[PDB]
């Protein structure tokens, strides 16, 4: 057993019947010395006496909130959480994996160090999340501004949480040797899990879509654009490449364009453009589209 926060303890358990539970002691944080009773939010009545309560913890009915009392007044509380280890594999069930079988999906609009990391859960009750960088490129994430939105995947509903983070010591022009290492601690009622992720800014880049898409016809069409203001500067170093089509990058009927100028023929439909880091195979941008 190890301490997660104040009066919150995590107990690792093997998900087998033969394994005897972890014998553990819970002490009541109080100056009182006599007539201390213990209760549990999953049992009825007093479950023990004294300032220290010794219990064996094996599965979830042994977890939860343990409370010590004296004459009807609650003295202290102690929350027991379980980290499941089944067949040698730490549990990954609170979160639902993305299309590419990962649990933490991070995106950065530029090399500034700003990025967003997101995850998916389906049972949205009794949840708690904490993220932290675990030689070390440390980051700070604004957990106080955590947000979520309802998303539908495989005709099933999920809630996509998102948090903004920022690399502490940053230097966009320099190349990256060590990766960023994040770990999300997920809690659901009495269950504890954590998920690790390592990445380089270069790989999670997804630039914003181009802006100002003005056309100019010919007897043939010449439509141009320009970089988004969120992209890193100078543009001579942080160059972009573009894929132009007329209706994971999802580029199937487009062609490589490096400058903003482009000549095109359009009988009908919508000519559409995206962006991508020119010198690295990172994520591409949401398509921007103008009518022919």
């Amino acid at each position: 057993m190890w301490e997660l926060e104040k009066d919150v303890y995590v107990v690792e358990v093997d998900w087998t019947p033969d394994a005897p539970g972890e014998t553990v002691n819970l002490t009541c944080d109080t100056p009182e010395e006599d007539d201390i009773t213990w209760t549990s939010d999953q049992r009825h009545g007093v479950i023990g006496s004294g300032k220290t309560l010794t219990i064996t913890v094996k599965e979830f009915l042994d977890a939860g909130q343990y409370t010590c009392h004296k004459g009807g007044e609650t003295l202290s509380h102690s929350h027991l959480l379980l980290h499941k280890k089944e067949n040698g594999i730490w549990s990954t069930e609170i979160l639902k994996n993305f299309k590419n079988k990962t649990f933490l999906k991070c995106e950065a609009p530029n090399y500034s160090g700003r990025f967003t990391c997101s995850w998916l859960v389906q049972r949205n009750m009794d949840l708690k999340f904490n993220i932290k960088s675990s030689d070390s490129r440390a980051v700070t994430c604004g957990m106080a501004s955590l947000s979520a939105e309802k998303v539908t995947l495989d005709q099933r509903d999920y809630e996509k949480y998102s948090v903004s983070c920022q690399e502490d010591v940053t230097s966009p022009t320099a190349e990256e040797t060590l990766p960023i290492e994040l770990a999300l601690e997920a809690r659901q009622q009495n269950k504890y899990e954590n998920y690790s992720t390592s990445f380089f800014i270069r790989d999670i880049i997804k630039p914003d879509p181009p802006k100002n898409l003005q056309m100019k016809p010919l007897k043939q069409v010449e439509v141009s654009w320009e970089y988004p203001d969120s992209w890193s500067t100078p543009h001579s170093y942080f160059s972009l490449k573009f894929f132009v089509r007329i209706q994971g990058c999802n580029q199937k009927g487009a062609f490589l364009v490096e400058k903003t100028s482009t000549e095109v023929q359009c009988k009908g439909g919508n000519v559409c453009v995206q962006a991508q880091d020119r010198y690295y195979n990172s994520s591409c941008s949401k398509w921007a589209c103008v009518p022919c």
Binding site: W15, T16, P17, Q42, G48, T56, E59, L61, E93, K191
Partner: protein, 114 residues
């Protein structure tokens, strides 16, 4: 006549399910799935603990690992069906839950004679 072929099993990493069939007229019948067990503790008295699910006309019950039923120790289950004021109980099953799946055969498991 009555509830028949009770089985319970794991359907996901966290979720579980009990299912049973019922021989007889199905109109105005209600089922109550019962579960009793002895939790590993520091008490020498047995102290059997019981839970139940009222499923109405349906013959399946869904729960999960944090609903309060042990999955790593022996538990006992049976179904009580109600028609009018008569209650027909099913035969009792005694099993673990974590290592049972929807395809695990209900019969043929070793039992200790004491």
């Amino acid at each position: 006549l009555g509830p028949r072929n009770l089985s319970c099993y794991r359907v996901s990493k966290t979720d579980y399910e009990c299912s049973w069939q019922y021989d007889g007229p199905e109109d105005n019948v209600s089922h109550v799935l019962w579960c009793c067990f002895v939790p590993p503790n520091h008490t020498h008295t047995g102290q059997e603990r019981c839970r139940y699910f009222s499923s109405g006309p349906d013959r399946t019950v869904q729960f999960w690992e944090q609903d309060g039923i042990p999955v790593l120790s022996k538990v006992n289950f049976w179904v009580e069906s109600r028609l009018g004021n008569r209650t027909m109980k099913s035969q009792k099953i005694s099993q673990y839950l974590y290592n049972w799946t929807k395809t695990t055969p209900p019969l043929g498991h070793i039992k200790v004679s004491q």
